[PDB]
């Protein structure tokens, strides 16, 4: 069509970089991951449906620990995602190293923005195709979204991947500021069932969370998940009937 997407360095007259927009469209062909922030914690949900009976049930399993109160989920290239996750970990331990200071969620998110923006600007390489959901409780719970470019955006609930568009609409209706942990855990599960268009069972999700009180990363176990699933699936069914 043109050659403004034949290079990463080359702007279009529209003002855009289509090469980045096609790193956007690398995200969307990875499956759904959703983060929900409440006034009590931040709760991070990611698909674990992808696979087969053949494969492990704990096949990727996106919700890797970055710090003891920072977890980060992915959508996009599971390749591109792992180095950024491992860099994410290294950036979190540097903050501790050099200050003996629990890593601020906002500042780690900054450091990821800087890290990818070197790969964006530089044309002997390409930018990452992955969007990470950065979440943790510094002493207030936070959820951010980092883009292929390295663009920082603050959210209070968001999703990334193919499931993004369905869920954005869903939270605009249901999401509220009076919400709580317990209520958030059910909401975020409903929204994950919309994305996959089918009902949840406790083993086809992983859910991580950083509470404000504990201020530790904790996984929800399959046994704890089952009752949140029962409650979630109630609305899943309704919104998938016509």
């Amino acid at each position: 069509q043109m050659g403004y997407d034949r290079a990463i360095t080359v702007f279009s007259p529209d003002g855009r970089l289509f090469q980045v927009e096609y790193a956007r469209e690398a995200v969307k062909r990875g499956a759904t991951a959703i983060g929900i922030k409440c006034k009590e914690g931040v709760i991070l949900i990611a698909d674990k449906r992808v696979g087969s009976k053949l494969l492990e049930a704990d096949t990727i399993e996106k919700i890797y620990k970055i710090d003891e109160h920072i977890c980060a989920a992915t959508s996009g290239l599971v390749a591109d995602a792992r180095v950024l996750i491992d860099r994410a970990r290294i950036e979190a331990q540097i903050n501790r190293l050099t200050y003996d200071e629990p890593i601020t969620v906002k500042e780690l998110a900054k450091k990821i923005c800087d890290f990818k923006q070197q790969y964006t600007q530089y044309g002997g390489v390409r930018p990452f195709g992955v969007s990470l959901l950065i979440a943790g409780v510094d002493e207030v719970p936070k959820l951010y979204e980092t883009d292929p470019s390295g663009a920082l955006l603050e959210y209070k609930a968001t999703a990334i991947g193919m499931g993004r568009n369905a869920v954005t609409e869903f939270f605009e209706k249901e999401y509220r500021d009076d919400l709580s942990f317990d209520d958030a855990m059910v909401l975020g599960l409903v929204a994950m069932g919309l994305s996959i268009e089918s009902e949840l069972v406790p083993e086809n999700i992983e859910v991580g969370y950083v509470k404000v009180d504990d201020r530790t990363f904790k996984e929800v176990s399959p046994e704890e998940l089952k009752p949140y699933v029962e409650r979630a699936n109630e609305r899943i069914r309704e919104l998938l009937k016509k």
Binding site: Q1, M2, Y4, S12, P13, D14
Partner: protein, 49 residues
């Protein structure tokens, strides 16, 4: 960002668009469109009325 073939399509296209509103209140000219999806159609044919 342009293309040459598109310039053709558009000068044709607007005359499609023109007639469709065009039938005077004297005579009843009804139409049925069909298309692959709205995903390949411009805003100006997706226009109300």
């Amino acid at each position: 960002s342009d293309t040459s073939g598109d310039r053709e399509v558009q000068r044709t296209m607007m005359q499609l668009l023109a007639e469709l509103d065009g039938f005077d209140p004297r005579g009843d000219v009804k139409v049925i469109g069909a298309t692959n999806r709205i995903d390949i159609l411009d805003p100006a044919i997706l226009r109300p009325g």
